[PDB]
Amino acid sequence: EAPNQALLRILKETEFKKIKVLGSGAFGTVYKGLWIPEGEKVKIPVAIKETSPKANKEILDEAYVMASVDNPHVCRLLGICLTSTVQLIMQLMPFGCLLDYVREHKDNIGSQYLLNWCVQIAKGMNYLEDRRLVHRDLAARNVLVKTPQHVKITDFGRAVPIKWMALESILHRIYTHQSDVWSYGVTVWELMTFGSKPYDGIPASEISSILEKGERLPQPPICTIDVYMIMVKCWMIDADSRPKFRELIIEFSKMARDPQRYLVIQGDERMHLPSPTDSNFYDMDDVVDADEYLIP
């Protein structure tokens, strides 16, 4: 098929400055930083993710997939630094992941924000389908928040989360774009429940039998039958019966026009989250967001 003419940028260690640590886990550590290219007179806020040969291959594969994407609703790789450890330099998503965001801000999250997020993920996911790319790990934890009004899909480690997986993926290890639709349904559930753990208390081994019986995630209280019907269609046994991402864009977009008709949240409209129209929302001299920094 079509040759992958993507450019992999090798960035110098001296070109960027690791401000602090955002979080550490099993993978290693993710830092907050600033990338100052050559003599460009720009400071780009970045996320730096940093020896065994096997771990280097895994991180280099994520870099390959990440450099091979370009969509406003997908995280792009800004470059890699070939140090003793090796690290992926990516766009800083200041508000962290959407799963933690909905949990920490439920009292200010309105129907407009929720439906708009659903559109943005369906759009990001429809892009990956265009680029013939199966995500295999879509969840609210793998959707990052640039601004409360702008989210992006991330984590291209896969290109096992049983509670996010389709039945074919659990039983036969089949991963299709329609298997991502199931994970999308679960992601939407995560958001509408403001961060609830799907199938809470139920062990992962029981999930397979539960779905086979016909059991599915409950109707979130804020959800109308219109929204829950979409979530249900995403969880069909027949993958071809599930909606396409191009249809999920259309469906959530229609709804996002009149949000209060499709999501019932007490105190809606009066609620507000930070915006570029806020006081001190963002040296702050010559700081540009990655989305505005492009080399020819």
Ligand SMILES: COC1CCN(c2nccc(Nc3cc4[nH]c(-c5cn[nH]c5)cc4cn3)n2)CC1
């Ligand atoms: C799992 O442990 C922690 C990792 C860092 N977390 C965080 N806190 C604040 C901002 C932020 N921004 C951020 C995070 C990012 N993570 C990735 C990434 C995707 N795949 N691999 C790394 C890109 C990216 C951009 N901004 N992240 C908190 C949880």
